[PDB]
A paper describes a structure:
In the "68% Fe" structure (resolution 2.1 Å) the best refinement solution was identified with the ferrous iron being present at 68% occupancy. Interestingly, in the “68% Fe” structure, we observe a continuous electron density from the distal histidine (H182) to the proximal tyrosine (Y12). Ring A with the substituent p2 exhibits the highest distortion in the “34% Fe” structure (+12.6°), +9.2° in the cpIII structure and lowered values for the “24% Fe” (+4.8°), and the “68% Fe” (+1.9°) structures; in ring B (p4) the angle is altered the most in the analyzed samples (−13.4°, −10.5°, −11.4°, and −6.7°) as a function of the site occupancy by Fe ions, exhibiting a high degree of distortion compared to the coproheme structure. The measured change of angles throughout the ferrous iron insertion process at the site of p7 at pyrrole ring D is also peculiar: the rings in the substrate‐ and product‐bound states overlap well for all structures besides the “24% Fe” structure (−2.1° in the cpIII‐structure, −1.6° in the "68% Fe" structure, and −1.4° in the "34% Fe" structure). In the “24% iron occupancy” and in the coproheme‐bound structures, the guanidinium group points toward p7, while in the “68% iron occupancy” structure, being in a split conformation, partially points outwards since one conformation is 5.4 Å from p7. The residue points toward p7 in the “24% Fe”, “34% Fe”, and in the coproheme‐complex structures, but points away (5.4 Å) in the “68% Fe” structure. Nevertheless, a definitive conclusion cannot be drawn as the ionic radius of the ferrous iron in the “24% Fe”, “34% Fe”, and “68% Fe” structures is larger than the ionic radius of the ferric ion in the coproheme product and would result in an out‐of‐plane position regardless of the side from which it is approaching.
Coproporphyrin ferrochelatase (CpfC) in the CPD heme biosynthesis pathway incorporates ferrous iron into coproporphyrin III (cpIII) to give coproheme, which is eventually decarboxylated to yield heme b by the coproheme decarboxylase enzyme in the final step of this biosynthetic process (Dailey et al., 2017; Dailey & Gerdes, 2015; Layer, 2021). Understanding structure–function relationships of key enzymes, such as ferrochelatase, is an essential precondition for the design of new inhibitors for antibiotic‐resistant pathogens, like Listeria monocytogenes. LmCpfC crystals in complex with cpIII were soaked with a ferrous iron solution and flash‐vitrified after 2, 3, and 4 min, to obtain snapshots of the enzymatic reaction during iron insertion into the porphyrin macrocycle. We report three crystal structures showing different iron content during metalation in LmCpfC, identifying the presence and defining the extent of the porphyrin distortions during iron insertion.
Residue numbers in the entry: 4 to 309
Write the structure that this text describes.
């Protein structure tokens, strides 16, 4: 019995939860009434709440099933550890410990590594284990190089492009993005930006879309520079220069439909394409598709074999 520590951001379960959730994201500093109002407005604009909770849950337990049905060397037990709402990363580790688990493999539901994302996940999990006395946490840092991951995204882009008139494929561009971070991470050799570039490069080689570009989205409310260009700004620039007629958005930094896709892409990017007169395309997120469960199953088993 090896625990499967599946970690993700988390999302408010109820509208009452919005305040403490934002407070946790802001490292305990309660946001103003104006910032809360904006956030609740965005959740309202996408229907009320994000489906991130149910998707994350199907992902974690679909992985556990996928691993357990494909071999009998080991039995896996999935525990969900969220970053900004319960159950927290530390609650999962405590749950693993009280359950007697001696060893566990941890994976973050985000394929790319960064000091701000995976590193924070791995740090909190290792600190909770050390304090508790177990289990031993064998962490996966990234997995965007998994061939099946690259292929799954190329298949989605290819399926969408096949519905674009050949008359217009030459005027179609693929926009590859992930959640922005403070630009300062580039001063210390953070791999995050280069991992995203590699991801876009690998996908581009396997799709019929002849143009592409790397953007970022969802940069925070601070006073510092963030990784750019923003996908909205990139969309305008690319239209001004090439007059592209089709924009295909794949935020490969995310693995599920949630606020940062349903609003930041399906609304704000759509607004831009509408403004310039181009078509908006955003292929389905991985969610809990068997193909994606197969991606995660391969990554975890590869990590176990090592
Ligand atoms: C690297 C990264 C990922 C990668 C994926 C992962 O790690 O899994 C990610 C994912 C997500 N981030 C999410 C939501 C939010 N992130 C915020 C704010 C921030 N994220 C940041 C970073 C990241 N975020 C940072 C550095 C801030 C600024 C904090 C500050 O201001 O000091 C805010 C606050 C308001 C705003 O900035 O808009 C919200 C609401 C949701 C789910 C939303 C839902 O569906 O409920 C998901 C999956
Ligand atoms: Fe975030």
């Amino acid at each position: 019995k090896v625990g499967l520590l599946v970690m993700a951001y988390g999302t408010p379960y109820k509208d009452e939860d919005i305040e403490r959730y934002y407070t946790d994201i802001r490292h305990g500093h309660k946001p103003s009434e104006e910032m809360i109002a904006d956030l609740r407005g965005r959740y309202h604009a996408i229907g009320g709440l994000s489906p991130l909770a149910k998707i994350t849950e199907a992902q974690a337990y679909g992985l556990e099933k996928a691993l357990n049905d494909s071999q009998d060397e080991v039995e896996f037990k999935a525990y969900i550890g969220l970053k900004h709402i319960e159950p927290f990363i530390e609650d999962a580790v405590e749950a693993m410990h009280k359950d007697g688990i001696e060893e566990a493999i941890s994976i973050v539901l985000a394929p790319h590594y960064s000091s701000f994302s995976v590193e924070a996940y791995n740090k909190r999990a290792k600190e909770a284990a050390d304090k508790l006395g177990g289990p031993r946490i064998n962490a996966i840092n990234d997995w965007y190089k998994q061939p099946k991951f690259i292929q799954m995204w190329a298949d989605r882009i290819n399926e969408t492009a096949k519905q674009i008139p050949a008359d217009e494929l030459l005027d179609t561009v693929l926009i590859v993005s992930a959640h922005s971070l403070p630009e300062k991470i580039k001063q210390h050799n953070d791999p995050y930006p280069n991992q995203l570039q590699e991801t876009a490069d690998f996908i581009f080689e396997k799709v019929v879309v002849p143009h592409y570009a790397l953007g970022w989205q969802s940069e925070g409310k601070t006073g510092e520079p963030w990784l750019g260009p923003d996908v909205q700004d990139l969309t305008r620039e690319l239209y001004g220069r090439e007059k592209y007629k089709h924009f295909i958005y794949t935020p490969v930094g995310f693995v599920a439909e949630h606020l940062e896709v349903l609003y930041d892409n399906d609304y704000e990017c759509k607004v831009v394409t509408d403004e310039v007169g181009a078509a908006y395309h955003r292929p389905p997120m991985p969610n809990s598709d068997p193909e994606f469960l197969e991606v995660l199953r391969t990554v975890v088993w590869e990590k176990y074999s090592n």
